[PDB]
């Protein structure tokens, strides 16, 4: 035995800060990297998925594909860009079906035209199960970021909240049957949709903006932490679907707990004043930026 | 029911990589870099892959595998006529890693942003078995040169010497405890390549195929040919060797000309152009010629 300090201890986001100290870094620390190029901005990102963590050899593999690229242009919009182009690096076992990689690229191929961005390169590696790693190269002509809130700023949410997290859930029982709103819920979970709609708004009018990809709560903190702010939420103000009330009916369970705390929606959490709000897009107020430090729900405060 | 639906091991890599190409209906993919339009410019995009028990092993220093995971990349940039940019990288690391690998990791990271002049302005990290290293790198270029410009007549470069990284690898396999100083420059050259970045202009402007050369002369020179529609004749005896890979070879038995030949991961490039646009001041080397036909030649055969 000898003893020395291992990732595990430092934590994840302590090692991030430890990459950024060695690396003298300014700009690390968002969903994007903003980098100064012709006037604009360009956006700089990479999210991966592993085989056994974020997805199964048996998942439909074009479903993998869509949620690839869109996982990754979650963090371009929630910065305020547009995805440009990508690349895709994989880790493949040789004894995977050649249909598997051309069905996950039927599914990348679909979300790029959605998205209007395209894949123009990547890489392919050896490995014993399958590892998916996405770079993503956006642009904007307004970067927001995770440090920017206002105190006096209301709180934004787009969607619904916890449908991914119930869609899991269905997806482990592996039922031989799902009922029509239990099929919505893991739909959602498996191929979810990046809020590009929301991208010229938040651009425009977020003094502070990040997709809620680990969950409100824990990604409320992140913002909070960064602006140097405290932020107030409202859980009766919690944007909720019917497909979730209905899973959360059927299994007596709380939907609220959902949607504090479930992961993998892909919705954005974004900051202004309430007057900037615009009703043609589906954004919940759901709490406000108060001067102070921490996340409070309802006057409790919950940490990650 | 029986699988009888085809591996990617029968496939092989290259053939995969034509699938992807078509299903994507893309037309750039192809080339050691991906060349965009943005800004009158042309952005070069490339991503590279360092693993661990294939490309390294965890007891190597780990700022030279730093220095190594940025340069690989760089040399792809570089391969095509650019300048490195920004880079990310993303990491799949075991929870129980020592956090000191991490840092000098990155020590070796930010020593080679600074000697090649980009930087490393973001990644990812993921929990894993085994430690994965993915480097994205984007640069730029007002003139990007692909693998399939070579022109007959052409006469075909390389930089710096071959075969010495194999050297390296091989020596570093012997786990000695000391090495004598010719060999520490051997494996200095594996361990921690140095990519070609003083060749960016004279790529740029006057290669009209390029590449740099990571699986090996003959293997890399294929991709060349064939991107080209070209055949490639190369005369042995005007490979570049290096002092120290020869007194290896002296030393174990070993034939440079082989190390030269096959030797992967020297990193040095693969150019051609008519043998009229020579640098005499780059340590480039005329090693063969361009002309109609396909495939690679070696003093004849091929
Ligand atoms: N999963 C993937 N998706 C899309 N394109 C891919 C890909 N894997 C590889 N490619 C593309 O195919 C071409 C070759 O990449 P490859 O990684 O084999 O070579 P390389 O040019 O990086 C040289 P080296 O030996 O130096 O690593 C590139 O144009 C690359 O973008
Ligand atoms: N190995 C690494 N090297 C450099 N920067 C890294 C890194 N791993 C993470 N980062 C950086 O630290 C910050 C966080 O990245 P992280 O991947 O955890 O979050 P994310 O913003 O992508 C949200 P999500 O939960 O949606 O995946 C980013 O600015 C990222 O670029
Ligand atoms: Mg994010
Ligand atoms: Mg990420
Ligand atoms: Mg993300
Ligand atoms: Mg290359
Ligand atoms: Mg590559
Ligand atoms: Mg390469």
Request: negative net charge; aromatic residues 10%.
């Amino acid at each position: 035995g000898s003893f020395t300090m291992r990732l595990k201890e430092l934590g994840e986001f302590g090692l991030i800060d430890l990459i950024k100290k060695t690396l003298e870094s300014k700009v690390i620390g968002d969903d994007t990297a903003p980098v100064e190029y012709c006037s604009k901005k360009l956006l700089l990102t990479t999210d991966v998925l592993n085989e056994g963590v974020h997805f199964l050899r048996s998942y439909i593999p074009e479903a993998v594909g869509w949620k690839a690229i869109s996982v990754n242009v979650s963090d371009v919009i929630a910065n305020g860009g547009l995805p440009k182009w990508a690349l895709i690096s994989l880790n493949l076992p040789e004894d995977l079906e050649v249909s598997y990689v051309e069905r996950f690229y039927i599914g990348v191929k679909r979300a790029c035209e959605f998205y209007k961005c395209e894949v123009v390169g990547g890489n392919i590696s050896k490995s014993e199960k399958i590892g998916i790693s996405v770079f993503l190269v956006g642009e904007t002509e307004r970067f927001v970021g995770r440090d920017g809130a206002r105190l006096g700023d209301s709180v934004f949410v787009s969607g619904t909240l916890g449908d991914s997290r119930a869609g899991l859930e269905l997806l482990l029982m592996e039922k031989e049957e799902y009922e029509p709103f239990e099929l919505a819920l893991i739909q959602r979970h498996l191929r979810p949709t990046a809020r590009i709609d929301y991208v010229k708004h938040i651009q425009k009018y977020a003094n502070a903006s990040m997709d809620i990809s680990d969950g409100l709560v824990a990604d409320a903190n992140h913002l909070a932490q960064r602006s140097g702010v405290k932020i107030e939420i409202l859980s009766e103000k919690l944007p909720l679907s019917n497909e979730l009330k209905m899973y959360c009916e059927k299994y007596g369970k709380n939907p609220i707990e959902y949607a504090l705390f479930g992961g993998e929606d892909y919705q954005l959490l974004f900051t202004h004043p309430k007057e900037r709000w615009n009703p043609f897009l589906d954004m919940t107020e759901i709490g406000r930026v108060e001067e102070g430090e921490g996340v409070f729900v309802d006057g409790k405060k919950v940490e990650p």
